[PDB]
Amino acid sequence: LHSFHSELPVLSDSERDMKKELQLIPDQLRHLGNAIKQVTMKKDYQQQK
Amino acid sequence: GTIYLQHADEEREKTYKLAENIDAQLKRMAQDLKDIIEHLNTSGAPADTSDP
Amino acid sequence: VEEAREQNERNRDSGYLHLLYKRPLDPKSEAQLQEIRRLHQYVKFAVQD
Structure with a gap:
């Protein structure tokens, strides 16, 4: 199906x-x-606190 | 066996490979979020079943 | 198999080629665009949530 759509000029x-x-x-x-x-660096900072 | 590539096909492949890389980035960013969320639900779970 | 059969014979008309300028996306290319839009909005909400 991917080859049958590639020949379009x-x-x-x-x-x-x-x-x-x-x-x-x-x-x-x-x-x-x-x-x-x-949001990760917020979590890292909260978890370490 | 008998065709020359055209400028449309070059520009189509460059468009679908942009969608591939965007899809493959979004499905990572959605799993990056899922791991962050699984590490948010599992931190709330006290792992001692002796407690009444 | 039958989509692939019809598209193989459709690509053999010389008139059809003239309409391709006004084709929509194929349903796989738009389903991937709709999935990219869905995932973008999900990754955007779950960042806020």
Whole structure:
């Protein structure tokens, strides 16, 4: 099924606009992947107290 | 056996590999959270069954 | 097996190629985008919770 979709000669309106959303998510993951660390370092500080 | 790759297919693979890496990052960040939560429920459990 | 049969024969029309500019995502590509959206919102809530 993955090979039967690879031979398509042009990008659609939906392939190009999913690509906009997928280009936005990494910087939200950069904030969430600091928020997890801030909550871990909160737990580390509370547990040691 | 008989095709030349096109610029759309290059740009499609670069889009699906961005979704793969985002999915494989999110499913880690969801387990990082699950381990943090399991270590939050298990700290509350006193491991002596002699207590009345 | 039968999705793979139909898509193999669909890819052999010359008219179909002309409509691909206006195709939505395939249901697997959008199901992965909906899972990425679901996981992003979950990882965002469980950070606050």
